[PDB]
Amino acid sequence: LDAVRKRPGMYIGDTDDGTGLHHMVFEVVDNAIDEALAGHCKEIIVTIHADNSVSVQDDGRGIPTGIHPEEGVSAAEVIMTVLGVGVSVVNALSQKLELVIQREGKIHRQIYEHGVPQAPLAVTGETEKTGTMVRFWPSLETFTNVTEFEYEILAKRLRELSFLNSGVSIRLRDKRDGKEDHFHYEG
Amino acid sequence: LDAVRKRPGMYIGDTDDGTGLHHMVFEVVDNAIDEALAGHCKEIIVTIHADNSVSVQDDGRGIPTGIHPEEGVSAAEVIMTVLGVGVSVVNALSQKLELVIQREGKIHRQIYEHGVPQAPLAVTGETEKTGTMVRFWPSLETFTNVTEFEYEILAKRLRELSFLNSGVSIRLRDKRDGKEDHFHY
Numbered sequence: 001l002d003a004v005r006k007r008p009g010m011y012i013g014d015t016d017d018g019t020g021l022h023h024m025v026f027e028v029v030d031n032a033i034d035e036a037l038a039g040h041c042k043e044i045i046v047t048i049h050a051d052n053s054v055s056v057q058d059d060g061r062g063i064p065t066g067i068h069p070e071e072g073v074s075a076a077e078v079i080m081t082v083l084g085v086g087v088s089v090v091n092a093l094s095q096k097l098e099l100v101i102q103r104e105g106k107i108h109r110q111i112y113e114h115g116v117p118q119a120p121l122a123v124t125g126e127t128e129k130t131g132t133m134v135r136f137w138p139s140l141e142t143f144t145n146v147t148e149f150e151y152e153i154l155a156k157r158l159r160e161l162s163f164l165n166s167g168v169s170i171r172l173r174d175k176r177d178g179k180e181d182h183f184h185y186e187g
Numbered sequence: 188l189d190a191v192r193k194r195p196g197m198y199i200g201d202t203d204d205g206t207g208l209h210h211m212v213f214e215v216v217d218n219a220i221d222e223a224l225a226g227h228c229k230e231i232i233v234t235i236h237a238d239n240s241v242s243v244q245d246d247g248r249g250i251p252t253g254i255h256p257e258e259g260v261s262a263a264e265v266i267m268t269v270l271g272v273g274v275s276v277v278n279a280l281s282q283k284l285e286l287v288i289q290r291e292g293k294i295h296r297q298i299y300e301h302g303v304p305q306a307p308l309a310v311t312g313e314t315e316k317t318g319t320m321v322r323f324w325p326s327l328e329t330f331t332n333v334t335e336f337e338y339e340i341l342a343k344r345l346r347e348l349s350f351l352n353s354g355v356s357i358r359l360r361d362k363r364d365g366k367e368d369h370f371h372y
């Protein structure tokens with residue numbers, strides 16, 4: 001991840017005009033949609049929290065959690081810490097990031113700061129759902145000037161995306177004012 | 188450098204009881220001593236600054252600044268960022284690290300935060316002098332509970348080092364209260 005840290009703008013775009021910041025959400029959403037697309041009920045929920053973090057939930061199969069035999073850490077950690085630009089870029093540029101994976105009846109949780117995992121991916125409970133959820137807090141050491149998410153920027157893009165991804169339900173929620181949208185196209 | 192940030196304890200020592208924290212200084216000092224050994228004068232100065240940073244100055248040749256043919260960045264940057272434990276460890280665990288090299292008539296300067304270079308090593312001026320200086324501010328995300336440098340802990344170790352490195356003068360200064368020592372065998 002140090003390559004990204006060294007030159008953030010080569011990976012995420014302009015980190016001062018808001019464009020980079022919103023790219024962060026779109027990269028996460030891209031991964032989520034690819035997760036949702038590989039199930040029948042396909043749903044993703046994009047939430048803008050009051051603390052200016054964003055979470056993206058998918059009801060997919062759940063990112064793989066097994067230990068990667070070469071890297072010696074969970075496959076999820078590898079995905080979040082190695083290398084659309086990849087989710088590891090979002091992680092590298094987040095002051096915090098919380099990963100929650102439901103798979104094989106288990107809840108898996110990990111936390112990152114600035115791309116550095118605070119502990120190994122841990123089974124912390126049980127569940128009968130499946131899916132991956134990523135919530136991130138953009139690094140204010142990187143993103144300057146425009147540091148808060150614009151509901152409308154997200155809405156427009158999610159709506160455009162809905163017509164390309166048939167059968168995928170996409171919900172957008174803004175916890176700062178209670179605004180909500182649901183984009184779900186026919187097919 | 189992510190393997191150090193992932194388990195800093197394994198590289199530097201205990202990060203909650205003051206062990207790791209002082210060890211950051213000792214690693215830097217080892218590098219400085221190596222440098223002072225290969226020049227004339229042979230002196231290092233260790234300074235505790237009032238803002239809980241430490242600086243370690245040598246009067247050595249200056250560490251090399253030329254571009255590293257494999258890594259493609261200055262050799263000094265290679266030293267500060269690619270994995271005694273290595274000064275890269277110190278750099279990785281410091282919220283800020285300032286590097287100043289006086290080499291071949293020129294002053295070179297670089298700033299890191301959490302081991303990330305803010306810019307490439309750059310020529311900033313001319314000088315007569317030779318030497319390397321690193322000043323580092325230990326990360327308060329890593330180092331907890333014991334977060335202020337203890338004078339006498341540094342003093343104890345430097346004294347031992349003075350006997351082992353016979354020709355080297357080691358000065359220790361505390362800017363918080365003016366305390367000072369001079370260890371020279």
Ligand SMILES: NC(=O)c1ccccc1O
Pocket residue numbers: 028029031032035056057058063087132133134
């Ligand atoms: N946020 C997600 O749901 C996600 C899903 C799969 C891979 C990476 C991700 O960030």
Ligand SMILES: NC(=O)c1ccccc1O
Pocket residue numbers: 215216218219222243244245250274319320321
């Ligand atoms: N601080 C020094 O005088 C030093 C000298 C050589 C290499 C790394 C260093 O930290």
Ligand SMILES: Nc1nc2ccccc2[nH]1
Pocket residue numbers: 005113114116141192300301303328
């Ligand atoms: N605050 C902060 N910024 C960082 C950048 C890279 C790794 C760790 C860091 N902690």
